[PDB]
Structure 1
Amino acid sequence: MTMMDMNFKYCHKIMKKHSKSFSYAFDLLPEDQRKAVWAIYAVCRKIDDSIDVYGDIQFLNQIKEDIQSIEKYPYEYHHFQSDRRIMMALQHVAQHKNIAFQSFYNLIDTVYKDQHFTMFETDAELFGYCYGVAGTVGEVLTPILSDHETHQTYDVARRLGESLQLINILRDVGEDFENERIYFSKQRLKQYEVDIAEVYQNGVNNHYIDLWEYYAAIAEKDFRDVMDQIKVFSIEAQPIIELAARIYIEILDEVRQANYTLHERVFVEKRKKAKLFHEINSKY
């Protein structure tokens, strides 16, 4: 097991540690591709976590700095300020593959920005956030999961990224509340006559259900769009990408079954995951 290999494995560990779904799925990619995926995810994972370190930025800029470095001189050695195991893997990728560097910045910008989180006025702000945090990730991933990236590829991938984020939001309503965050828009809330603090104490009612389902619909629909254009992705990637999607949609029927609880994280059993993989796998 060589030296890069050792990096990609930290990267892998990190991915596997955060999201069990993504890993379940993207691990079934070919060697070349899944290792690049691992690199990217880890970089991003770091970017999100860079805040809970000292209680201040630092890092984040380092990470920005190490990235900006690779962007510039990809074939020179760098002494990375942040995490070296990761920045290495990425550099390796960056050699063999195109990288939407901008999108990393977009994501970093989004994280800088989230320090002064005020609630969203309107769904537009919400949708703008989803872009920042996930639409960006989809773009970065695009050269990895398709043979000839066209505007069209990028668009789908982004749209998938945004959807999943929306679902993860939908799943984490309680948990997010606890850390003084609410992602539903002020607008949508007033319209639906929901106060999240009140639901948290007194359990769900009909208004919450409806506001949640309003958003559940947006996701569901967007996921159907993406499924239709799955073909923009390379042949090996398609069933994998369908998998990750399916697993994530599946999260919604979970929240439903749990009666939209705000006092815990629902999950998709590993066994159900496999069941899905089988259904998809079977049709390929």
Structure 2
Amino acid sequence: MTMMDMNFKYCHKIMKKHSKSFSYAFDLLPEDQRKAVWAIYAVCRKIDDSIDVYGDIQFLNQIKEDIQSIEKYPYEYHHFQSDRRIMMALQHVAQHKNIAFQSFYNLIDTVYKDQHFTMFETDAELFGYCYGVAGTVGEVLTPILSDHETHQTYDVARRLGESLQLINILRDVGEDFENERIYFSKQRLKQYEVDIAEVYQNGVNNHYIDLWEYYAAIAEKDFRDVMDQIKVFSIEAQPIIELAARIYIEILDEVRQANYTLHERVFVEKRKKAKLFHEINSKY
């Protein structure tokens, strides 16, 4: 294996460690496309984890400067300040694909902002957050997952990303609360008469379930709209994206089956993923 092979294998390790679902689906892409996804995934993960390395924005600033170096001089040799393996792989991708760098900067700005997290007043603010951490990622992936990017391709990829984030939120209510984070909006919490701290201590109730299902209906409708527009993506990526999406839709049912528990993280069995892919592939 070459040095560059090693860099990509490391990016892959980071992705599989963080998400079995996404790795399962994306590893099914053709070699050059899946490697590009690994690199983008590893960069975004490093960004999300950056603050906790020392406890401030040092490492994140270094990541940002590395990405700016690649943007400005794609073909020059760089001595990277952050994670060399990841940045070398990213640069390799950037030489072959049109990366939306401002989308990385948007993600980084969202992470900076998260240092002074205050709850969202409205769902509009929640959805803006979903764009920031996940719609941005869809934008970056767009040139990898489509042959000819148009505004529709970015729109669909952005919507998919934001739907996946909403599902993450719906899965992780309990864990996020423990980490002093609540992502449901103050408007919606008040409208449904829900107090997460109260639910965390005393268990689910009908008001909570209604609030949860309100957001779940949103994620579900977005997912359906992505599915109706699946053809914006390359023929090879279409079944993979459908699979990633369908696995995440299944997380919602796992939550329901676990009675919306705030005290464990539910998941889709690896064997159940394989089943969904069989069902999808047949159609392809």
Normalised-by-shorter TM-score class: over 0.9
Residue segments in structure 2 that go unaligned for 5+ positions in a row: none
Counterpart of 1:45 in structure 2 is: 45
CA displacement 1:170-223 (0-9 Å, x = unmatched):
000000000010000000000000000000010000000000000000000000
Q: Quick one: distance in 2 between partners of 1:17 and 1:93?
A: 21
**TM-score between the two structures when normalised by the length of structure 1:** 1.00
How much has 1:35 moved relative to structure 2? 0.2
How much has 1:156 moved relative to structure 2? 0.1
How much has 1:227 moved relative to structure 2? 0.1
Q: Secondary structure at the match of 2:95?
A: helix
Q: Secondary structure at the match of 1:263?
A: coil
Q: Quick one: distance in 2 between partners of 1:124 and 1:256?
A: 26
Q: Does 1:189 align with 2:189?
A: yes
Q: Quick one: distance in 1 between partners of 2:75 and 2:193?
A: 56
CA displacement 1:12-38 (0-9 Å, x = unmatched):
000000011000000000001000000
Q: Secondary structure at the match of 1:39?
A: helix
How much has 1:51 moved relative to structure 2? 0.7
Q: Quick one: distance in 1 between partners of 2:153 and 2:179?
A: 35
CA displacement 1:109-155 (0-9 Å, x = unmatched):
00000000000000011000000000000000000000000001000
CA displacement 1:247-280 (0-9 Å, x = unmatched):
0000000000000000010000000000000000
Q: Quick one: distance in 1 between partners of 2:224 and 2:76?
A: 44
Number of aligned positions between the proteins: 284
How much has 1:3 moved relative to structure 2? 1.0
Q: Secondary structure at the match of 2:53?
A: coil
How much has 1:41 moved relative to structure 2? 0.3
Counterpart of 1:212 in structure 2 is: 212
Counterpart of 2:255 in structure 1 is: 255
1:72-91 residue pairs with structure 2 within 5 A? 72-91=72-91
Kindly, what percent of the aligned residue pairs are identical?
100
What is the alpha-carbon root mean square deviation over aligned residues?
Answer: 0.3
Q: Secondary structure at the match of 2:221?
A: helix
Structure 1 residue runs of 4 or more that deviate by more than 4 Å after TM superposition: none
Q: Quick one: distance in 2 between partners of 1:214 and 1:206?
A: 12
Q: Quick one: distance in 1 between partners of 2:238 and 2:282?
A: 13
How much has 1:169 moved relative to structure 2? 0.3
Q: Quick one: distance in 2 between partners of 1:220 and 1:96?
A: 34
How much has 1:158 moved relative to structure 2? 0.2
Q: Quick one: distance in 1 between partners of 2:4 and 2:281?
A: 31
Counterpart of 2:202 in structure 1 is: 202
Q: Secondary structure at the match of 1:96?
A: coil
Residue segments in structure 1 that go unaligned for 5+ positions in a row: none
Q: Quick one: distance in 2 between partners of 1:44 and 1:175?
A: 21
